[PDB]
Design an enzyme around this catalytic site. Structure first.
Site, mmCIF file in Angstrom:
data_model
loop_
_atom_site.group_PDB
_atom_site.id
_atom_site.type_symbol
_atom_site.label_atom_id
_atom_site.label_comp_id
_atom_site.label_asym_id
_atom_site.label_seq_id
_atom_site.Cartn_x
_atom_site.Cartn_y
_atom_site.Cartn_z
ATOM 1 N N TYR A 291 -7.128 -2.010 1.444
ATOM 2 C CA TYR A 291 -7.810 -1.274 2.335
ATOM 3 C C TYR A 291 -9.262 -1.763 2.569
ATOM 4 O O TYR A 291 -9.886 -1.995 1.409
ATOM 5 C CB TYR A 291 -7.999 0.039 1.893
ATOM 6 C CG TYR A 291 -7.781 1.143 3.210
ATOM 7 C CD1 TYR A 291 -8.810 1.416 4.205
ATOM 8 C CD2 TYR A 291 -6.726 2.018 3.277
ATOM 9 C CE1 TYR A 291 -8.599 2.313 4.987
ATOM 10 C CE2 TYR A 291 -6.533 2.851 4.285
ATOM 11 C CZ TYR A 291 -7.774 2.998 5.219
ATOM 12 O OH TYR A 291 -7.678 4.039 6.065
ATOM 13 N N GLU B 65 -11.642 -0.798 5.214
ATOM 14 C CA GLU B 65 -12.586 0.144 6.074
ATOM 15 C C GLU B 65 -13.989 -0.637 6.020
ATOM 16 O O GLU B 65 -14.585 -0.934 5.147
ATOM 17 C CB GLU B 65 -12.970 1.564 5.645
ATOM 18 C CG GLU B 65 -11.542 2.213 5.583
ATOM 19 C CD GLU B 65 -11.674 3.825 5.599
ATOM 20 O OE1 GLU B 65 -11.230 4.535 6.463
ATOM 21 O OE2 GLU B 65 -12.622 4.175 4.903
ATOM 22 N N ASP C 256 -10.982 -7.498 31.233
ATOM 23 C CA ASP C 256 -9.850 -7.480 30.241
ATOM 24 C C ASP C 256 -8.768 -8.621 30.581
ATOM 25 O O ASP C 256 -8.184 -8.669 31.417
ATOM 26 C CB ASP C 256 -9.071 -6.221 30.659
ATOM 27 C CG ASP C 256 -7.670 -6.172 29.777
ATOM 28 O OD1 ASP C 256 -7.159 -6.984 29.307
ATOM 29 O OD2 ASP C 256 -7.150 -4.785 29.574
ATOM 30 N N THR D 265 -5.756 -9.060 24.526
ATOM 31 C CA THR D 265 -4.592 -8.773 23.612
ATOM 32 C C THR D 265 -4.639 -10.005 22.711
ATOM 33 O O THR D 265 -4.656 -11.106 23.336
ATOM 34 C CB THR D 265 -3.381 -8.546 24.486
ATOM 35 O OG1 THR D 265 -2.276 -8.453 23.421
ATOM 36 C CG2 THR D 265 -2.852 -9.837 25.663
ATOM 37 N N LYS E 29 -0.175 -12.156 23.761
ATOM 38 C CA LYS E 29 0.751 -12.759 24.733
ATOM 39 C C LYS E 29 0.665 -14.368 25.061
ATOM 40 O O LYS E 29 1.288 -14.972 24.391
ATOM 41 C CB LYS E 29 0.097 -11.809 25.838
ATOM 42 C CG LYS E 29 0.478 -10.510 25.872
ATOM 43 C CD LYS E 29 0.262 -9.615 27.217
ATOM 44 C CE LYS E 29 0.514 -8.117 27.138
ATOM 45 N NZ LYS E 29 0.201 -7.409 28.384
ATOM 46 N N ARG F 232 0.317 -8.570 17.187
ATOM 47 C CA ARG F 232 0.295 -7.627 18.180
ATOM 48 C C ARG F 232 -1.198 -7.111 17.883
ATOM 49 O O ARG F 232 -1.173 -6.346 16.672
ATOM 50 C CB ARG F 232 1.500 -6.606 18.401
ATOM 51 C CG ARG F 232 2.531 -7.126 19.054
ATOM 52 C CD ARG F 232 3.893 -6.394 19.068
ATOM 53 N NE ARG F 232 4.706 -7.235 19.970
ATOM 54 C CZ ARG F 232 4.537 -7.761 21.233
ATOM 55 N NH1 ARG F 232 3.446 -7.537 21.888
ATOM 56 N NH2 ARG F 232 5.460 -8.433 21.853
#
Lengths: 443, 443, 438, 447
Positions: free
Chosen positions: A63, A65, A206, A232, A235, A241
């Site tokens: 983890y 953060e 975008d 993204t 793609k 992803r």
């Protein structure tokens, strides 16, 4: 002692095919589906093994953060180095300098990324304007902010920058967004900047649909004109992803850029928790590979394939929105053949061809389908291969007309008919046969 | 030229990570080593089994599955549907729920994301919520909605349900939230339900920290009292990183939660789900429903008592003077230590902890949070935790010693850390200790 | 002369008296003038205005539109209207012992509600948080467009619990904290509320609507000693015309930021032009507030309230807090087994106007709210209130008697001997007292 | 007893001229100003005595929170009957039946009225679209999302095609026509077609045409709009305030209208407190009078006077926006005479002529400050007729001739200008001519 040590190893090192046969079977059936079918969804692509090995790693155990060098938790000395490296590779990928640009790679998705920018820059309810694909509020952006979207000229299919300027000057949105929808032609990012400047808006792009073309200088560069670029990771880039945010840094009453602190904070702690460390490693690998001549050639072939496929469908009397494409994707209007996308989509599915219906225009007809080269280009298909695929797409259409004609008034009885049609079963076989001719990354 | 480009694809697609990206692979290996050669006392953290990694690092990342099972945006989801459906069935079974009374959305990218989808789904922006707080506007929940949080009694360290009833009746929030923070004692979910019902509020539980104990009936069951339960997939459950939403269905006329929440997740807030994560989750949930897992949790709690007992014996102060679960808040101020510094010295000795907010009545920075789940997974038992306790004290004794001599300057402090013999000696003891325990999935 | 004939047609229309121009309305206006004189007014809001005030209201001033601020109007021709508004402002400061260098005042607000909303609109972003007293889904526009967490009186005591207020305010951290507002029969510890405001970093506002009179005459706590903003109604204590008014601090505390924001909220954000006629009327009322006559009017008002309280306690009645520091009383009727809803309607039948009120249950519908100002204005004194107390009891005794059967008693109501007898006693009583402007 | 009963009467009946001389003097100075000047502000009008007698009455004494028959307070038997009568007169004034339309008469102002409609029908932040007069200013634009539309800059007329395009795009919950001082008739029928296409509630603010609408001397928005708000005090010569008409009873899902309960509640208790009972009585009187042939003949003259004034100014080479008017008001472009409204306005003031500069689109597609707005209702009320307006036109030009002359000599400073203004011969001469002119005309309610 050694008994317990073996109990752990037993459980921890048990392979998927033993640990969960029911899942393993489904995964194997899906791997087969992927191999034995044509992929024409312009989004979709196939990732290399190294990316999967990154995803499927001990990195998911840690983890993290926070940001590199400023984490909530100890032990992140190696995860920092990976994230940092992933960042450096993201800049170099899009030919950017660290003094002029920064990048946050934690966003769980592109949607997530966009909403972080809005959250970071704007007060709730402030105004944004972006492109749109033709309860009643759908996107969270339109729920928590004021979205007045713009659309393509209904006759031309092209963007009308003049109406856009009028519209933007009147609505004075805090953020103006270009890119977004599946648009088959290049953007005039320069123009959109002039507009943004006039109505005192922050310009965001975008670049999800063009990430590939941008990095390889095979289309207009939004980094030359936008203050923010989201995308993204999975793609064009054939990464994992997720989403990613570029923002400007340093000098431009406003003396320097104010973006980094606001956006970083919006991603975490406002909107997300920890990042997917395994996704980020995967992303670094993908981005190393984008910066290569191999990847440039990949995009070049992707685009040649798209012209090949376009030319093929125009030769066959088909109607394409704008009459072609500058990039990797095609909007095909089926209404001249008397077909809806909704049904053609579902026939193609039966024949192991995956595509997706789309909104097209001056009312909104349901008769568009969206097609793209990236996936099959990745599997090593070239221009003649796409000419073959065209033939399959027409045979599928000819069948669809033929079936709508015999089943004029059957909502239930049409879906049943599908499973025992001879022309479908013939075409399915031709497609599976075709498909098996091309390699499939990571087997 | 055909077979030459079919080999060029295979060459790229099947390249292992240690070849494709040595710089990344080296870092991944350094982190795997770090994980093996240190003690993990972060109560969040755990280690996943191999099957879970194999799911993550698979061809499932290739398929975009926007939507729900049976109602997707894209064709080809035949097998992904059966996986998601299986993952859902397993999620209910895990928590002893029936499909006609409860449903579950497994797409949420994170537990934060999941909570926010609940709020977005059920409430209009700016409507009121109330939940616990860990002692400007920070969370997205508090930006886009009206958050009036509640807190534990500062003297007791336990929750004051009477003060909570007062506050909730006064504020009449649309949604009342229990769980959330790392709280070392059991919740009275029955009581909180009585309060919700009085102020006409929907009762939600965030079971992130207790997901494990709940499934194994080793703590209070919030499903017996809440209308909605969110959770993290990757803490107790040793699944992949993400979130999950459970919501009631059918007769109480009926529940109104399913359509609203599903829609909020998609399309409002997210894109397509991580199909790889969802498979990995299915595997993890199959394993929760086993006796092995119940025993795992049981041991996890025995280890926590063993560690609490050990520290109390050594004159330590614990918030609430122990725990009902798997985690411990240790107040260091009686030893004259802040969590900020003890944290950083433990890091240097391969011990991973994290400083926490605790009440002194001011908030002192002298808390640290410890959990058993990670070392319990690696096959540690009571006496091992007693050993770990000894290390935690030797670390504290060193920290006092150092603050005293070199505490004058932060620079002069960090130097002494890097070059101190007592640290190096205890680091060696910890590595030696650590290597005695297995580490799930060593390729 | 077609000229002269026209000039007459205009005069004919323009100077036609109301009683000719609209008999139907005039008849109703006459019936209401009668009702006012032949009744007792115990509603603590209500009061009766002097002739001069009415003359201002019904004047040529209504003819001139004055969108804007004095010396900064949208329209030409405002030279005299400016002098009137400026005069009304100076008189408002004078009334409340304020200096122009430390306070300003906006007198355009169409109502007290309108005035409070302008302050919120002026100072806060939509959705930001406020906290104010409440009389025990979203009703007020303040609670619609902003986030209102209200506070209430201690349910047992009926007094305000400043400790619980401090806890609630520190918790909720409102941008604006509001004192006054509801009809509260005791003095406010404004000094205390300031201490709280300062702790949770809130702007302190007072709604002085109920106490406007007492405050000006220094016959209760002065909120101007402690608040940054005071709003009020112009027509309760002050016996001015219907509307509202906003006082705000100016100059150094670096400097106050209230004036430009609040003026702009009133106009052009929330209203159009001011009622010039109401402002002149207001100026007249405020000149009269600043007089020893007015001070004596308030003094009597309070003596009259103590007289009434005493009279009702002596008659076994239960008063919230067991009395008052000001001009109004909350009377709990539940010990006599009565709801306000019914007592109210019986009192109406007897030419006694009062109003049921929310009171806390030991949340009961058995409170009524009573005040002295109205009858005090008509020249009633202590002993007169002692007579009125009798009437109030005789009304109660009748109400218990009629609640024997239960809705069905609407017939009995219209045709009751005891009602008719008390109505006559009240009309006979009422006609003893003058009614300003006949 | 009797000594205290005389102490009340002494105070209560003291006339204004004794009770407050300083105010009385100012009130008298303003009455004189009103009489000895010309009023060409198209908003302004003069009210009859009956209306003043209503305003300045005991009605102010009674608090009437709520609606007729559903009040918070007792003692409202008669106040109710008055409000109810005011309502019935409001319907009959605009030729409406109670089964098809309802009306709230409590709104403190027309702004207040519009905001109640929005508050009543819409959640905060929802979208409205209305006309604009060329930071967030109006409370409507603060608490809701206002995307306004504008007149065609070349023509000065409304562009209903661009309006359709814009409305279909933005899909506002409420579409608003009227609003600004527009010198030409509205195509309400067309605006309805648009509203229907974008699924919006059609509201008309009829403030500037209230008079013409009642008398069927302009397009009727009640034939097309679901809501009509207005000002009580412009055309109607009533007291200052606002009023809301909404549809009732029958009209995909929508079976009956849903407007009344939402609007009434928004007015009270959301936004306001008690109504001005004295304004409502005054309004009732005003509305009785609107339903007369006398009032029809008033409006008719009003319009004949406007044409007379337009014709007069055209004849003297003036430039009017849209080249004239269909109603009672005139937009006059001064930029061909090289004048701004801001200054012409302030010279006209000095000569006892009240008008007001206005935003216009100039010869350039830019927004010139060179407009002024003029109307006939005020001097029409005082018994002026066509030839009188041709006189007033002569004054308006002389004033302009002076203003150019002044800008030429004394333009150097704003302080040296305002001096020249106070001490100019040609102003003084025209001020006299105007005063002399004005005193020829009756002024309603001069006792």
């Amino acid at each position: 002692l050694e008994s317990r040590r073996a109990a752990v190893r037993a459980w921890g090192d048990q392979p998927i095919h033993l640990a969960d046969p029911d899942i393993h079977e489904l995964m194997e059936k899906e791997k087969q589906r992927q191999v034995r079918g044509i992929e024409l969804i312009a989004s979709e692509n196939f990732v290399c093994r190294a990316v999967m090995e990154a995803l499927g790693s001990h990195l998911t155990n840690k983890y993290s953060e926070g940001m590199p060098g400023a984490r909530y938790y100890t032990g992140n000395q190696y995860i920092d180095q990976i994230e940092n490296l992933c960042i450096e590779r993201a800049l170099t990928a899009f030919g950017l300098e660290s003094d002029k640009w920064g990048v946050n790679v934690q966003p769980y998705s592109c949607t997530s990324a966009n909403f972080a920018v809005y959250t970071g820059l704007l007060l709730p309810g402030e105004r944004i304007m972006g492109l749109d694909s033709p309860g009643k509020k759908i996107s969270a952006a339109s729920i928590f902010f004021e979205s007045f979207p713009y659309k393509v000229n209904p006759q031309t299919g092209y963007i009308d920058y003049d109406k856009l300027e009028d519209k933007a000057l009147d609505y004075r949105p805090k953020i103006l967004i270009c890119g977004g929808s599946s648009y088959p032609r290049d953007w005039d990012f320069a123009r959109v900047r002039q507009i943004a400047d006039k109505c005192g808006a922050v310009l965001m792009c975008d670049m999800a649909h063009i990430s590939g073309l941008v990095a390889t200088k095979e289309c207009s560069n939004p980094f030359d004109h936008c203050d923010i670029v989201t995308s993204t990771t999975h793609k064009g880039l054939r990464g994992p992803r997720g989403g990613i945010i570029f923002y400007r840094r340093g000098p431009k009453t406003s003396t320097h850029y104010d973006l980094e602190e606001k956006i970083n904070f919006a991603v975490f702690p406002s909107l997300q928790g920890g990042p997917h460390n395994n996704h980020i490693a995967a992303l670094a690998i993908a981005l190393k590979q984008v910066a290569t001549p191999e990847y440039k050639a990949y995009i070049q072939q992707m685009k040649k394939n798209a012209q090949a496929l376009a030319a093929a469908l125009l030769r066959r009397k088909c109607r394409l929105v704008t009459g072609g494409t500058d990039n990797h994707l095609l909007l095909w209007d089926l209404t001249p053949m008397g077909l809806t996308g909704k049904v053609y989509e579902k026939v193609c599915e039966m024949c192991h061809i995956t595509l997706n219906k789309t909104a097209i225009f001056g009312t909104i007809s349901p008769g568009g389908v969206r097609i793209g080269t990236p996936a099959m280009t990745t599997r090593g298909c070239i221009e003649s291969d796409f000419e073959t695929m065209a033939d399959f797409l027409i045979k599928a259409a000819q069948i669809t007309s033929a079936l709508q004609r015999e089943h004029g008034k059957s909502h239930k009885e049409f879906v049943k008919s599908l499973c025992t049609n001879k022309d479908i079963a013939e075409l399915r076989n031709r497609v599976e046969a075709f498909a098996l001719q091309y390699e499939m990354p990571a087997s």
